[PDB]
């Protein structure tokens, strides 16, 4: 402005100078600085280079310290001065981050000023033990029919989204994030889910497109986007998931419910492999370090569902894994499959057969299952799952085709649970074995339009009770038969 | 027996041999004479004749071994110095002799309270204020420590003072100050 | 407006700094006195 750039952006700047313990860069190359000195620096402590850069002290060797650089090592020369910070790596946590795009260290990259964060939180904290947790009961609503019906997800669960490239994993995550809009602006406080999206190793314009999609649907007012893109140093892409997880643990520890998507963890594993090979640590399978399973398990163990003596918070994780040529038996895919509480398998064969989302219901699993569902969706989805199985072994058969064409869904169109259960009702009770599949989606579009235009009271009772009572079942029978007559 | 740790730790084979000799002489109260003897043998082994003889890799080992023993008994050294040169000659570490003497010298230096202190300015500064700087920085030391100053000038700091005493380090240069205030003004 | 307010201000923030480096031995005395205050 005209005076507001000196008044406190200068006069208040903490220009103090103090005696600080330092070291000296012996060598620097490929983002790994070997610092002589720093006798009292702690393991995994954040240090600071004389050129404004920052780094984490990973290797504590007898003659030097292996400092990984959070940035570009072009600015660092031999003989530079590395000053301690005294604190292990920590990120700013709070509610102010909601609506911001930050990098792996919590700095704003959307140009909207500093985050007004009061508290900070380590990134390498310990997950809650056995006592602070409780069973995963509340449902996390995605708005996707196949997920919310056959692979339901709870609050506190770790559901893996796994598939090849360009199969629809990011789209599943984006639908899940957009769907929480109805609950977030509503009245019931313990149905609000604050989403978090971690972009690891992605192209920067992809994250720009994603932020545009999430702000077009007004879904950014409750979403944090941590982004360690492909041009960011390997330590930043390795630290992004832990930063995002701490930002979500803030909510989880304070009676609120959060959701975090790691998109994806294959690139975090690759960044960690690079960062550890450059530290001269011996490689393992596929040159990955020995402790990459630990790298992912200590991260996915922090997604918990706390009990009421701890606030009743929650943190649902949705790790993403890319596989090479459908090879699910690789190293990192098998690690993360062993860690998580279920999977959502996507295939390109199903994707090109018109089945979108290409969720393989045969392989998709939810280890919690029915415990993470509403009663009405459970009532319909049991029979729907069994009928879809019966169709998949004999690929009745027309009812199964009708059900699969019912499962198909568009992009960025997350339905409500009430509408979802009404559709799968109209599908499993028999009112669709008369239409030809090439008009099934037409019927559902028109039927949803009609029901949301005329029958808000039935859907309101569905949303209030959670059960499809005999009164509700009869009224829904009425509506579906009359519309089928109209169609 | 068990070794005594020097006040500083040097690493590599140079550090191994220097720590060995420190533990050797400290067990016999002979650190200073062996310091002198090792600096002397450094002078001796930077001789063109002897350096071109013993650093020659295709000269047989026992030949340079006996040559070192000859010059070592001629120089009237302590048995510790003789044993060290013989042990370096057996293991084939004649290239590491001045590395070992340098590590031992810095061990003895840090043993004598000598802390390395460095001050930096844009241009060479007064010697009276240099004595004031010495006396003031002496306060950052324990009693029994010694000031060993190295004042280098760096005109890129635009003025100020960059003091590094041992590993403690204060940055009073105005270049880092304008950098700090500028990053504060931008964010 | 926000486009002009941004670039003009960042040009402003660049003017002052390459101007102050253009623009004194009391600092070396101030550094000696400020060093004694560390204790």
């Amino acid at each position: 402005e005209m005076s507001s750039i000196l008044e406190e952006r200068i006069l208040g700047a903490d220009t103090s100078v103090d005696l600080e313990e330092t070291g000296r860069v012996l060598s620097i190359g490929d983002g790994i600085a070997r610092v002589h000195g720093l006798r009292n620096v702690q393991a995994e402590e954040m240090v600071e280079f004389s050129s404004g850069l920052k780094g984490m002290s990973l290797n504590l060797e007898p003659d030097n310290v292996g400092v990984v650089v959070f940035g570009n090592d072009k600015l660092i020369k031999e003989g530079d001065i590395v000053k301690r910070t005294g604190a292990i790596v920590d990120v700013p946590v709070g509610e102010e981050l909601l609506g911001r795009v930050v990098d792996a260290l919590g700095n704003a990259i959307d140009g909207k000023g500093p985050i007004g964060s009061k508290t900070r939180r380590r990134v390498g904290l310990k997950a809650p033990g056995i006592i602070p947790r409780i069973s995963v009961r509340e449902p996390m609503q995605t708005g996707i029919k196949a997920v919310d019906s056959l692979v339901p997800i709870g609050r506190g669960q770790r559901e893996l989204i796994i598939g090849d490239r360009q199969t629809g994993k990011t789209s599943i995550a984006i639908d899940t994030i957009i769907n929480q809009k109805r609950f977030n602006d509503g009245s019931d406080e313990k149905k609000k889910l604050y989403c978090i999206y971690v972009a690891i190793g992605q192209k920067r314009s992809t994250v720009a497109q994603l932020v545009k999609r999430l702000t077009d649907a007004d879904a950014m007012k409750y979403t944090i986007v941590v982004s360690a893109t492909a041009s960011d140093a390997a330590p930043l892409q390795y630290l992004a998931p832990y930063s995002g997880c701490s930002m979500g643990e803030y909510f989880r520890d304070n009676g609120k419910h959060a959701l975090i998507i790691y998109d994806d963890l294959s690139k975090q594993a690759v960044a960690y492999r690079q960062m550890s090979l450059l530290l001269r640590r011996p490689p393992g399978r596929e040159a990955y370090p020995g402790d990459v399973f630990y790298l992912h398990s200590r991260l996915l163990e922090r997604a918990a569902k706390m009990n009421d003596a701890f606030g009743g918070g929650s943190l649902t994780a949705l790790p993403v894994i890319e596989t090479q040529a459908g090879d699910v038996s690789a190293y990192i895919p098998t690690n993360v499959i062993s860690i998580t509480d279920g999977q959502i398998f996507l295939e390109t064969e199903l994707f090109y057969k018109g089945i979108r989302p290409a969720i393989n219901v045969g392989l998709s699993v939810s280890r919690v299952g029915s415990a993470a569902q509403t009663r009405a969706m459970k009532q319909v989805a049991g029979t729907m799952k069994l009928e879809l199985a019966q169709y998949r072994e004999v690929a009745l058969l027309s009812r199964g085709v009708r059900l699969t064409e019912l499962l198909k869904q568009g992009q960025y169109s997350p339905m409500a649970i009430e509408e979802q259960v009404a559709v799968i009702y109209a599908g499993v009770r028999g009112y669709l074995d008369k239409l030809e599949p090439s008009k099934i989606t037409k019927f559902e579009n028109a039927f949803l339009s009609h029901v949301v235009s005329q029958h808000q009271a039935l859907l309101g009772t569905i949303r209030a009770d959670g059960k499809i009572s005999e009164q509700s079942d009869a009224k829904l029978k009425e509506i579906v038969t009359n519309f089928l007559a109209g169609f | 027996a068990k070794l005594v740790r020097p006040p500083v730790q040097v690493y590599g084979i140079e550090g191994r041999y220097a720590t060995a000799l420190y533990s050797a002489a400290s067990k016999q109260n002979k650190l200073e004479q062996v310091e002198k003897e090792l600096l002397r043998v450094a002078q001796i082994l930077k001789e063109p004749k002897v350096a071109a003889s013993v650093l020659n890799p295709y000269v047989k080992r026992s030949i340079k071994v006996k040559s070192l023993n000859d010059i070592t008994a001629k120089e009237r050294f302590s048995p510790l110095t003789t044993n060290l040169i013989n042990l370096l000659a057996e293991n084939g570490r004649l290239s590491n002799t001045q590395g070992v003497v340098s590590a031992f010298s810095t061990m003895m230096s840090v043993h004598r309270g000598e802390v390395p202190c460095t001050v930096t300015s844009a241009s060479p500064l007064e010697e009276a204020t240099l004595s004031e700087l010495k006396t003031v920085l002496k306060s950052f030391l324990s009693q029994g420590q010694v000031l060993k100053l190295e004042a280098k000038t760096d005109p890129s700091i635009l003025g100020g003072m960059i003091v590094r005493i041992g590993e403690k380090y204060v940055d009073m240069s105005v270049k880092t100050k304008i950098q700090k205030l500028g990053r504060a003004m931008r964010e | 407006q926000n486009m002009m307010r941004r670039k003009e201000q960042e040009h402003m923030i660049n003017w002052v700094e390459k101007h102050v480096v253009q623009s004194t031995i009391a600092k070396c005395i101030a550094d000696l006195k400020l060093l004694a205050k560390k204790a």
Partner: peptide
């Protein structure tokens, strides 16, 4: 405080 005054002078000079 050559840098206290400069940051407030040079900006006031920018006025």
């Amino acid at each position: 405080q050559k840098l206290f005054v400069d940051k407030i002078r040079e900006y006031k000079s920018k006025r």
